Structure formats: structure tokens, C-alpha cells
């Protein structure tokens, strides 16, 4: 297959404005949300139909209980961090865990935490240790590393359980996740040449401009890959035209194993 990933995020907010949840957790497969939970609903709900259709109620009920427990733990952890930073007001705590099954069959696994949107603790599952960014993280790192079994548990979950969940969800949503919608590509004039792709799935795409055959990395302006709203994506890349010498410019697009070239005559 192509490369696929499974990730779970958590957001916690210490003093949220009225209405905004104290806690949120969302799962993703590649760019697709699959599941969601927050402190206002107190329920785990599917965010993809093929999750809803393949997981019995006993599954949603079980992780609803687990999530309510994780919410309280997250609150406790945020409380301790903001005491140790000696910080007033509202602050955020985030977590991300997940794994990747690469096309070559190899795997990766990650777990990390952030405070106020900045790296805080990063797990290394090969050295079984935590990287701390400052001395508040270092205090937390000492306590987490004293419990060697919990580290071993995370290694097992990242290398074996997460990969097995990913394969199970990849099968559930295969009509979505494993399909290919080729890009529609054109060149417009605006002075600069704009190479525009749209209508493509998956979102991973490489677009670049060549000049006479050689690439021109420092001269290219790359736009972002953007959701169209219908399950496909669009992107662009521009290059600034030289008015004093003619050059052969060509746009190069690579998507899902297929390369395209649009020569600008």
C-alpha cells in the first residue's frame, strides 16, 4: 500500500472561556478524523461513517469510559505543570500518540506532549527514555522514567497494538483511504506562471517548476495542499518569469506513483 498513519491527539485547557471544552481527544487515520470525545458530551463518537458501521456499541461504550478517565488524568497533569511553571490564567496541554505503516512494510511510532503549543516531552521508544525541553519537563521525566514498566508498555503499544489498530481501520475504510483520484493540472499566467492541481486524493502531492531541465528550489513559491470540501484536495506552485531571456519552463507533478509534465510553450 501507500504509507498510512494512525494518531490520537488530546487538548486540555486550564481555564476555558464559557462553552469551550476543558478536554478534547480526536483520532485520525491519515488526514481523516475517525473518532472524537470531549468533556462536554462525555461520549466517544465516530467521525467517519466506516468507523460507525464496523464497530459495535460495546466498543464505543468501553472507550467512552476510558476517555472519561483520561480526561481526569489530563486535568491533573495540566494542573501540576502550571503549578510548576508558576503560571496564571489559561494554558494548554497537548498529547499526540500514534504510528505509521510505511509502504516498504517498515513501521514508526511516536508519543509526545506539548505545553502552550510547544514541545514539552518526547518519547524515544528505542532508548526507552523521555526528552525534556526544560526543567519542569525534567521533573516529569524523572518520575515517568522511574516506572520502567510503563515505558515498556508504551513501546509495545506503539510497535504492535497501534500498527494492528491501523491495519484494522485501513480495512474498514479502504474504499476511502486506498483509492486514487488523479489531479487535474493546468498552467495559468498572472508576472508569474502558476501551476494548479485540483480534484486529487490522497493529499500527498509533489509539484515543482523546472527551468531548462534543472530545478530552481530557491525561486519557487509553494502553496499549501488544501481541502476542497468534497474529499479531494488542491494545490499550486508559482515561478517568477524572467523578461530578459527566454527559458523553457515546465511544471512537474507527482502523485500516487505517476509523474506529469506540463511544458509552457
Amino acid at each position, epitope marked *: 500500500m501507500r504509507t498510512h498513519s494512525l494518531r490520537y491527539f488530546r487538548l486540555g485547557v486550564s481555564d476555558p472561556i464559557h462553552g469551550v471544552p476543558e478536554f478534547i481527544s480526536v483520532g485520525y487515520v491519515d488526514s481523516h478524523p475517525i473518532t472524537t470525545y470531549d468533556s462536554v458530551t462525555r461520549q466517544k463518537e465516530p467521525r467517519a461513517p466506516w468507523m460507525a458501521e464496523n464497530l459495535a456499541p460495546d466498543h464505543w461504550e468501553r472507550y467512552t*469510559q*476510558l476517555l472519561r*478517565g483520561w480526561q481526569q488524568m489530563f486535568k491533573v497533569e495540566l494542573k501540576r505543570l502550571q503549578r510548576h511553571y508558576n503560571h496564571s490564567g489559561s494554558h494548554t496541554y497537548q498529547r499526540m500518540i500514534g504510528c505509521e505503516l510505511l509502504e516498504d512494510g517498515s513501521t514508526t511510532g511516536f508519543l509526545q506532549y506539548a505545553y502552550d503549543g510547544q514541545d514539552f516531552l518526547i518519547f524515544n521508544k528505542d532508548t526507552l527514555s523521555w526528552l525534556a525541553v526544560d526543567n519542569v519537563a525534567h521533573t516529569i521525566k524523572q518520575a515517568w522514567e522511574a516506572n520502567q514498566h510503563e515505558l515498556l508498555y508504551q513501546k509495545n503499544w506503539l510497535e504492535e*497494538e497501534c500498527i*494492528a489498530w491501523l491495519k484494522r481501520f485501513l480495512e474498514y475504510g479502504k474504499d476511502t483511504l486506498q483509492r486514487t483520484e488523479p489531479p487535474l493540472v493546468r498552467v495559468n499566467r498572472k508576472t508569474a506562471l502558476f501551476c494548479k492541481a485540483h480534484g486529487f486524493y490522497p493529499p500527498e502531492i509533489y509539484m515543482t517548476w523546472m527551468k531548462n531541465g534543472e530545478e530552481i528550489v530557491q525561486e519557487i513559491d509553494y502553496g499549501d495542499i488544501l481541502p476542497s470540501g468534497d474529499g479531494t484536495y488542491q494545490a499550486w506552485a508559482s515561478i517568477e518569469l524572467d523578461p530578459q531571456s527566454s527559458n523553457l519552463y515546465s511544471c512537474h507533478v507527482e502523485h500516487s506513483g505517476v509523474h506529469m509534465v506540463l511544458q509552457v510553450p
Partner: antibody
Amino acid sequence: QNIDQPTEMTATEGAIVQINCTYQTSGFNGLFWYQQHAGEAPTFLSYNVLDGLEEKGRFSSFLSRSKGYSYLLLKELQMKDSASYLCAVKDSNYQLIWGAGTKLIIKP
Amino acid sequence: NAGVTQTPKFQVLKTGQSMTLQCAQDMNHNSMYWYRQDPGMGLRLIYYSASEGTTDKGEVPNGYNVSRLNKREFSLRLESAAPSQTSVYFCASSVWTGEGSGELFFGEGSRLTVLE
């Protein structure tokens, strides 16, 4: 899902006994051993989640994830080791499945 | 420093009678559990409480109910005792749940015999 251990084992004081635990589960988040003296509460002995052997005094615990089996190894057996030994496995949803327990009888 | 305290140690009941088993833990744990233990089989979860303010059924919930009264206490109610609820009941607690590493701490056990 199921977990299996022998009903009962008998060894002699001073010897070595290996108590087996095989499990069939969807997903695996760890294997626990607990000691339960007759009429008393189970208490935590050991936890394995990666492959291999971990020692803890006279007791060692072994795990092979690919075989789905673990053993609890008790050396230099004493009469106070007479007890039930309970194996328990955390499945993919962090739910414990308990073996029925092995009663260890020690001959003085 | 008490650990898990559950009561009563022994109880006899007539079929149809009600009973509440008490459990408290002074360890500041978040997760609490009620098990039954019977000859020839592994511990079976009756109900559990992953955290204060939430509870849910286990493997064998029928004929029982629970109340997570606060962080410390988790009571098991038998509302209409039946002879099949003759068993030894164990309350347990753990620091958290949905962590893989944390062990359970068990109470002393409650021995219940239900008679016609």
C-alpha cells in the same frame, strides 16, 4: 479470548517450579502474575509486556508474545510459597482476562 | 495506609434479601472494581468505575448495581439475592486505568452464601 494455566502443581521444598500460562487474545497490553494465599486477597507479583525474562528475588517471570505464553519461575521453594498463582492478560481494550489459577502444593 | 477496606467479611442471605457491600480505598486511586471469584474459573468483573463520576458494567452485571459515591468509595448492591450469587466478592483499585502497566490492589474479600 481465553487464558489457560494448570489447575494444580506439587513440588518439593527447596526445588524449582515453573508455572505456565498460555493465552489467546485479540491484542496484548501486558501479562500479570498475582499471588493468592488461601482465604486471602491476591497481590501483585510481576508484569511483563516485552519478550524475555525478568527476575525479582526468588521469582522470575518470562514472556513470549509470539508464542502467547508466560511462566512464573519459583526457585528454592519454601512452605510459605504454598498458594494459588493467578495469571492475567490485558487485551487490546485494556480489559483483564484472568486465568483460573494454579494451586502450588509444597512437600516439606 | 489501610489500602482497600471492604465489608462485611462474611454474610448469609435468604433468597430475595438485599445486601450492600462496602469498599473504600485510602490510596487516592481513580479506578475501582468489583469482582466475584468462584471455584474452577478466573475472576469475573461485575462492575467497574474508571474514574470518579463514571461507572459501567463488567462481564457479569446482572443482579448487581454499583455506586461510585466519591473518589474513595465504591459499593456493590445485590438487590434480590439469588443462590447463584453465592461467591467470594473482591473489591480492587488501581491508580488509573487504560494504562497497561498498573497493578490492582485488592480488598480482603467478602464471602456471601445465599440460601433458599
